[PDB]
Symmetry: C3
Subunit: 427 residues, 3 copies
């Protein structure tokens, strides 16, 4: 079964692993075996997750030094402004789809909890200007060691920009030393992309195991008003792809169906690992060897988008806030639901690219409409129900969190003529 596994096409092999993993997970769940999946299956998932985690800092660091030196700082800034306008725009849209979809499913209207005028609590802000200053690393080695992507993006861009100015200086010796430094990062970056390719041969096993574990643990839990939550959240995400991404893709002259075909590996590992950051190496390699995007773009947009652009998380928080407000019988007035638009965008910007991060940031969004997490209050009680299904919901939103990054990257890269069109012609 070494020849039987490797020769079968890898397009449909990661997908075979997902489907069979999900059913295997569901059968283990109704029948009560989820503990064995956690023992004898999940480690294979865990192994696959680690192999991807291992590549994030080198590949983000090296691709961005190389990419930032490959494009004038004038265009880099132009790429920054565009991707951020794409990012906030599609994120706002995601919160919009969240609320509409939630109203249509009448989420949490059968929960029937009582409540009262909320308990007055002094709101911690939490404070933004420190969040921005912390983008600037004080010790870039420590940032590498602590795995901080956003400060590393900052150092990487700075060094890459500095390297080019040096290679154009008059003194021959400065040119060769700067080139030598750039080749080291290029050699490392080319070596990282290569290793991502080898790991993706194990991905069906890891994907199978990851989905098997999640489906066995939390499948039993999608039953009641939570089933209505799960069904709403996935409906909304779909619309964010099918309307927002496709229309935006089609408007800019990218075939949406070819985009989804190329993006799938980024989408499926985003799904089972439920970490945008942990999935980043797959996303970037899709951008290079599938989408045809230049390293001078996706080396910036993708690691940045993995953190600040989450349409999936933004939409998941839209749906569930309505759940809590309906579960306690204090439905959100229309003027309240507009505040959600602003504060969900912010919360999704601020969630980490790691499993579970969005459900915690949901609390900030609840506190913004006047629903406080005071234990053991009924608002705190509804919030607990949402946490029960969180993995089931995390898979979906992590996938849309990463997909929107690719859709934006390909769209921005097209308008900059850094997209390689030979990769999109059908034959």
């Amino acid at each position: 079964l070494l020849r039987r596994y490797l020769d079968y096409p890898v397009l449909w092999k990661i997908l075979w692993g997902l489907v069979l993993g999900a059913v295997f997970g569901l059968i283990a769940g109704h029948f009560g075996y989820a503990g064995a999946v956690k023992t004898y299956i999940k480690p294979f998932g865990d192994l696959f997750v680690r192999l991807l985690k291992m590549l994030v800092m080198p590949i983000v660091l090296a691709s961005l030094v190389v990419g930032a030196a490959s494009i004038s700082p004038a265009r880099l800034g132009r790429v920054g402004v565009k991707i951020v306008v794409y990012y906030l725009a599609t994120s706002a849209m995601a919160v919009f789809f969240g609320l509409i979809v939630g109203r249509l499913f009448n989420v949490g209207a059968n929960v029937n909890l009582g409540s009262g005028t909320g308990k007055a609590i002094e709101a911690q802000p939490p404070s933004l200007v420190q969040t921005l200053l912390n983008i600037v690393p004080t010790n870039p080695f420590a940032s590498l060691a602590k795995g901080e992507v956003l400060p590393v993006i900052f150092f990487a861009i700075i060094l890459g920009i500095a390297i080019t100015y040096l290679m154009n200086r008059n003194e021959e010796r400065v040119r060769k030393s700067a080139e030598t430094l750039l080749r080291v990062f290029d050699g490392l970056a080319e070596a990282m992309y290569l290793i991502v390719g080898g790991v993706m041969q194990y991905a069906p096993i890891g994907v199978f195991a990851l989905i098997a574990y999640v489906m066995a643990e939390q499948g039993v839990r999608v039953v009641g008003p939570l089933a209505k939550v799960v069904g709403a959240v996935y409906t909304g995400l779909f619309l964010q792809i099918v309307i927002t991404y496709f229309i935006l893709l089609k408007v800019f002259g990218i075939d949406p169906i070819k985009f989804i075909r190329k993006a799938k590996d980024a989408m499926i590992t985003a799904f089972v690992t439920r970490s945008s950051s942990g999935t980043l190496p797959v996303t970037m390699r899709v951008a290079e060897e599938e989408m045809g995007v230049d390293k001078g773009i996706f080396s910036f947009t993708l690691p940045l988008g993995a953190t600040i652009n989450m349409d999936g998380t933004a939409l998941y928080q839209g749906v569930t806030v309505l759940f809590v407000a309906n579960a306690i019988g204090h439905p959100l007035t229309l003027g309240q639901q507009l505040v959600v638009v602003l504060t969900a965008v912010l919360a999704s910007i601020g969630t980490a690219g790691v499993p579970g991060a969005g459900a915690i940031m949901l609390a900030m969004v609840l506190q913004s409409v006047g629903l406080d997490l005071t234990p053991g209050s009924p608002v705190a009680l509804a919030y607990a129900m949402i946490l029960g299904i969180d993995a089931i919901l995390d898979m979906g939103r992590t996938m849309v969190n990463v997909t929107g990054d690719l859709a934006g990257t390909v769209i921005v890269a097209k308008t900059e003529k850094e997209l390689d069109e030979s990769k999109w012609i059908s034959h």
Copy 2:
């Protein structure tokens, strides 16, 4: 208003931010708006500090590998003996000015606290040998990530010395691989020096906010006998520059007025950041692109000096120990006043290159003459007053801390003739 800032000459621009920040802070603080300074002004300073901090480890590491490869270990060792002989010599001189000036200002004679005969406490053993053994890093990657300058100095010197012996090898491949590695550090260090320059275009703004905030918070507290302390410390610091450094520079045939002219960016950044380590990239760049010192000198002396050479701190401990001993009515006998000379030199050596460290190390100087920090005893109370004005005193003392590093580097480089004499003529 943003359109006149760039065209105005960037020669002295960093000094206007210093004065106008000092004046703006003194006014806003006296009006009870010192809180507004802290909110809307200080972050621009905090940004200028982070951008400099991010460069300390890369630039210290890369400049010292490159420099140590460019010089003979016999000479470097000789440079070591010279710079260390200069370092403690001028520090001893600084404690001397502290005591004289402090006596001249009769610091703390209006305090009138009235303590009794001292109490004996340690209560913990101090350790010097471990302090030396800690010069040798156990994990140089860990040392980089923890931002420990002296273990990096040790490892970098070794790697640089090692590279040249490899480039002198009889085997073509070993020469080429060592050449390749040296070009990496050279390319990296050249990129760090470029970035320090770009940051310094922002330095006026960063300088303005830092001074503004310090003046706003602590301006109001320079009123009582603490004003006499402030006046003594700055008078002494002035003398350390004007007598010790000028005579030493002039004895060795360096123009003192031109020296202060080149050092100003380092001097003002030390003043406002109150961190020798954080100012190091500005200091080293001053030493490269202003003084004309070779990397074989300043890439060793300057990071070393940022820790072990503090004349400013040594003198601040002279003045303030006299303040505390006079404030409690137990003035220092001359033989105690001589112990301060030795123990401030020791305390200044062991003081970190980061804000506030010398006021902690002050405690040891007190415990050496018999003034113990037992709470709530009067020694602990006088010490507390000194901490109240500490930022105002840190700005001055940090500036003299790096200035002596430059003066020693320029003097040492001259005696070894790695100082480039073409920068000090006008043509």
Copy 3:
């Protein structure tokens, strides 16, 4: 004068430091000055340990990227299979001598404690599947900074393998950039081996000071039934070298006496520092410039062996399980002594390469045969006696731990035709 010491040939000079150092330390122990040794001598030994520590991550990372890129992955796996088979074989064999040598000395039969039937700790469970998974680093920068050797071995091997495939591509640019990167690691590894050479000029002093402090503290403490332990462990370790290693070395056609002659720098450094990982740069350098092994082998086997292959530790735990069981009047039945073989091998595999780690993992071996560490029970009382002499036993067992790694590396390297015979030709 410094100028006289530095010019004396280092062949036997590290040995003069060990021999004079051990003797010196013994004198202060009977004479009650061992506190002054800890003060005015030991810092020179501790300095020698820090300088070797600073080279471990650079030399392991750089040598293995270089080495792993110079050998086909197909062959690297075969090195892996061979060295692991040697490792489990010789580790078991070491535990076997541990029991033979240990019963021969009748260890701890005069102690005469209670103990009665013990009370049972059913916690903690050993965790493996995780321990294996953590071999894959999640952040290689984090692994370097935290000094985690095994994940760095994993990352470096992967990177070495990838660099080679890259130098084989069509585009000049990919060839050229991958070539550039390889040379950086090549320059770095070559610089590390050089610096190990300089540190070995200080090593006689460091060796003197380390063994002096150990003989000074724990010298007074071999008077008892513990003296029989010191004698057994050292007897066994000796047998592990002269029987197990020598017969194994000779089968494959390596002169055993030349092996000990070249290995001595690593053996004495493992002995005094009591850290296999701390001694690694000497071990790897002895392997390069003395044994003549290629970086494509010793850069893998030696860092891997520094953790998972400990024959000294395996034989040490064999000896002391018998000590504890006889001390309480519950001598080990034969079937218990078979469990030890499996579980001492497992425990030795899991023992860290740092001082004292083997006495801690000893608890895992006792806990397998029913001798439980519940305080203040008599079993816990015997274990305390073993910890009292632990340094004396650690010096010896760390040496056999490192010696076995070299013997395995040289044996495997011969069967792969990577050993350079001009170093062995008389």
